[PDB]
């Protein structure tokens, strides 16, 4: 059941990564610029099955973090230095409700995986006393 | 000699389990220290190394002759430490169970021998 | 474990922005006053791996 430990650890890492992405997105709901002067484009993690040697079932690995392709919001501030020739400043496309729900669901999955890992470890501990 | 050689593999594996758990506890203790890269050891390679050549120490402040490797960070952090708590606690629990397994195997072998000797 | 620090930074900078806005509002009667603009910049932390 050590592969179960690998599975649970990988899934905990994946859900923690999703929670961190959601928290960073929620922080930057109103951000107007970054270091280079480009707008903050909301991040989304990509989950993929980690079953490389384990047929079609395995843990979950975060393949990548990608900028969401939803169109950037536009605000008319012609005095802003970042405004283009048309006077529109690009603001992030972060959906507040989606990020809140993502945080909540990620937390619940994290707790479920922790409970699974604890039950598996207890089962291993009891297996260690076979025949006695 | 024969009894020492027969019980040497599990004894050395259990000692390496103890040292790895010391390292993991050090990683957990320094989890909030800014600028601390998490350290861990490759159990199998170091176990074979200790198997072929006996255990050695840097000094004896003393420490083992194990290679302290750096763990790959998962996600970045401004303070600058790579101690990810999920990884630390999973490795801690796994090392715990494997150390208990080593204790069980060694105790079973030693009883499996007292059974023969006892009369 | 470090998302708490991201959220704490967001909350503290929201407090700073509120302080700027309150200072601007306190000077609604100040003769010849220029309001201080406020903007939340995003700083991406570099590192590994994702």
């Amino acid at each position: 059941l050590l592969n179960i430990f690998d599975i649970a650890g990988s899934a905990l890492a994946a859900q923690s990564k999703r929670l961190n992405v959601a928290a960073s997105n929620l922080a930057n709901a109103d951000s107007v610029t970054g270091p280079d002067g480009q707008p903050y484009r909301a991040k989304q993690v990509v989950f993929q099955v980690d079953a490389a040697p384990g047929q079609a079932t395995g843990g979950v690995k975060v393949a990548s973090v990608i900028e969401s392709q939803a169109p950037e919001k536009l605000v008319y501030e012609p005095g802003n230095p970042l405004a283009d020739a048309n006077g529109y400043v690009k603001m992030p496309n972060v959906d507040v409700v989606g990020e809140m729900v993502n945080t909540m669901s990620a937390s619940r999955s994290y707790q479920a995986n922790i409970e699974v890992l604890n039950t598996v470890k207890s089962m291993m501990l009891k297996t260690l006393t076979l025949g006695q | 000699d024969r009894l020492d050689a027969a019980l040497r593999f599990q004894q050395e594996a259990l000692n390496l389990r103890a040292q790895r758990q010391e390292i993991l506890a050090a990683n957990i203790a320094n989890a909030d220290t800014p600028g601390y890269q998490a350290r861990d050891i490759d159990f199998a390679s170091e176990l074979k190394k200790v198997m072929v050549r006996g255990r050695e120490e840097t000094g004896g402040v003393s420490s083992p002759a194990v290679d302290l490797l750096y763990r790959v960070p998962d996600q970045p952090s401004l303070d600058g430490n790579t101690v990810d708590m999920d990884r630390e606690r999973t490795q801690f629990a796994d090392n715990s169970l494997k150390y208990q397994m080593g204790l069980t195997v060694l105790g079973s072998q030693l009883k499996g021998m007292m059974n023969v000797l006892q009369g | 474990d470090h998302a708490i620090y991201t959220a704490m930074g967001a909350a503290s900078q929201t407090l700073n922005q509120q302080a700027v806005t309150a200072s601007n509002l306190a000077n609604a009667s100040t003769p010849g006053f220029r309001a201080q603009l406020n903007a939340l910049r995003a700083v991406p932390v570099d590192g590994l791996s994702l």
Binding site: - | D40, V72, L78 | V45, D46
Partner: peptide
């Protein structure tokens, strides 16, 4: 490197600047 794997070389110091 795969996250969670073991490497003999330390990770570089990470920084988050405000202005490039």
């Amino acid at each position: 490197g795969v996250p969670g794997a073991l490497s003999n070389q330390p990770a570089p110091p990470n920084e988050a600047p405000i202005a490039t």
